[PDB]
Write a protein that binds this ligand. Structure first.
Ligand SMILES: Cc1ccccc1COc1cc(Cl)cc(-c2cc(-c3c[nH]c(=O)[nH]c3=O)cn(-c3cccnc3)c2=O)c1
Ligand SMILES: Cc1ccccc1COc1cc(Cl)cc(-c2cc(-c3c[nH]c(=O)[nH]c3=O)cn(-c3cccnc3)c2=O)c1
Lengths: 303, 301
């Protein structure tokens, strides 16, 4: 029993974190085989930041402009190139701790684990969702750039996020590991705002199932609804639309539970229209939207 | 900026997790140097749970009755002893991944990370606190016994919790790594009510300081309070008493923010009285009590 915001075990990623310094800029790199990946803004000075020409900034640098430290040892940089917003530094020695891995780009509403790092050294791990507005509500300080987010499947690390910047509102923006930004953001110090965020409906449903699985079921009711009817309510409360795909995804949770997805939508509809106020769910006074259906299955099944 | 329930990176502990089986009973062990630590109730059958005599059950076992599996490898048990409610299995190979470590017994209100495991393999990691009633509010299923809680201030792992059992209320009980239970509990399937679960007041204060550090002050007010008057009020909400030790401990956060500890106590008294009125603090609609003063300074600056 119990339900907590749970991160993947981070051991396989901790072995890949290094420090990357170019001039006076220092941040984290991800060392896999003989390449270190990090944000391309490492090659910026404070003033470059305001309007960088990354082509020209990198044309001016050579391999010896980059210091890469794996804890105590120095990795000799023997090559460099940019892929989109990520710098790739070829080093002279392959990481003996490289895990089975692949680079994957996630959709908004998917969750992942963040290994927050400073000076190449892991300092904490926590669980995040890619918001519908493509930001993530992380916990990052200066020096955290290059920290990565990931999921684990069996024995394969799927890297999905690299940290690049904090927006003025205090939320965070980054890329996949091929350097493609999530969201309409640019790696430049210039005014930019995320769109208005929404609530990840399918994840709220998942968490309500987690509540039922844990014996918390005061919010169930005799009613059902239609996808079409529910989405009228959802749109009005800034909830993401619920799709037939979402219904299917929730299948195994409805099985594991005995509550049909459109039945649970009827409970969520009432929670939106009337609140809960008096009561809590799974120890929360808010409707939690950073657990996916699979998150719930894996935590409640012991995967 | 931002503020999350952050756990320590679990790699150093993952490399210590093994599976221990005795008869039909299987759980996790912690493999440090040439010893595997696990809950002694691994030697119980379903029929032994109501009134186990562990000394009698253990004397009937030989080393080869304990099957220890590290990944794909079977570790050979060459000896065994019982220390309080933990079993120590000596094995013939020391763990090459053993981190720098120590055992520490923690106090109520302290936080730690949990690496939840099944069959010696990690499921996930999350952050917990030792409740005032000496339970923890974990996320644990059958087979999770032997999972451990830890901190890693610097590069040394401090093991502070081993998971033993789930109470009928759905909260969890276990031991330090010397096998002494936290709280009055016993590794036996008998009734054992946990005390009232009160709120960790000093942690709630640290967390309000976290909110100020991160730029939010809406909940402060113009009042102060005596410590005595604060405690008289707060205990009516089942908040733990705040001691002068807690007040001293909050000194550093008080200094960074410019908010006297008893002025933040006044704000807390008013939050209990008023609730949030539709607002949130650090993304929560409830007052959060599983961040310590030490956690806040670690995460915020
Ligand atoms: C987006 C926006 C809009 C208006 C005004 C300002 C902005 C912000 O604009 C940028 C652009 C870029 Cl390209 C990078 C950054 C950035 C750099 C650094 C950094 C620099 N120098 C080091 O040596 N190490 C480092 O980590 C760190 N953080 C950071 C800080 C805290 C949490 N999370 C991340 C950055 O956000 C910021
Ligand atoms: C305390 C109390 C009071 C009144 C009624 C019941 C109770 C509970 O009484 C005990 C006593 C003991 Cl000594 C152990 C357990 C227990 C065993 C097992 C277990 C067994 N058999 C395996 O093969 N592997 C295993 O992990 C697993 N869980 C467990 C289950 C879920 C989460 N967390 C832990 C136990 O709580 C239970």
């Amino acid at each position: 029993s119990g339900f907590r915001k749970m991160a993947f075990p981070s051991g396989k990623v901790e072995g890949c974190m290094v420090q990357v310094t170019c001039g006076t800029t220092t941040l984290n790199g991800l060392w896999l085989d003989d390449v270190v990946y990090c944000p391309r803004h490492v090659i910026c000075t404070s003033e470059d930041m305001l309007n960088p020409n990354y082509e020209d900034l990198l044309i001016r640098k050579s391999n010896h402009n980059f210091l890469v430290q794996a804890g105590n040892v120095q990795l000799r940089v023997i090559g460099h190139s940019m892929q989109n917003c990520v710098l790739k530094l070829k080093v002279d020695t392959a990481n003996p701790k490289t895990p089975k891995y692949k680079f994957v780009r996630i959709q908004p509403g998917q969750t992942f684990s963040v290994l927050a790092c400073y000076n190449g050294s892991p300092s904490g791990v926590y669980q995040c969702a890619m918001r519908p507005n493509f930001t993530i509500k992380g916990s990052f300080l200066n020096g955290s750039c290059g920290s990565v987010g990931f999921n684990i499947d069996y024995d394969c690390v799927s890297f999905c996020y690299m940290h690049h910047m904090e927006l003025p509102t205090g939320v965070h923006a980054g890329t996949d590991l091929e350097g493609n930004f999530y969201g309409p953001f640019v790696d430049r110090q210039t005014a930019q705002a995320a769109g208005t965020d929404t609530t990840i409906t399918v994840n709220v449903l998942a968490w309500l199932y987690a509540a039922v699985i844990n014996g918390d079921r005061w919010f169930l009711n005799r009613f059902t609804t239609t996808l079409n009817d529910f989405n009228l309510v959802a749109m009005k409360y800034n909830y993401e639309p619920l799709t037939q795909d979402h219904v299917d995804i929730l299948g195994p949770l409805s099985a594991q539970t005995g509550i049909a997805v459109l039945d649970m939508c009827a409970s969520l509809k009432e929670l939106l229209q009337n609140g809960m106020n008096g009561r809590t769910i799974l120890g929360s006074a808010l409707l939690e939207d950073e657990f996916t259906p699979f998150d719930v299955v894996r935590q409640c099944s012991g995967v």
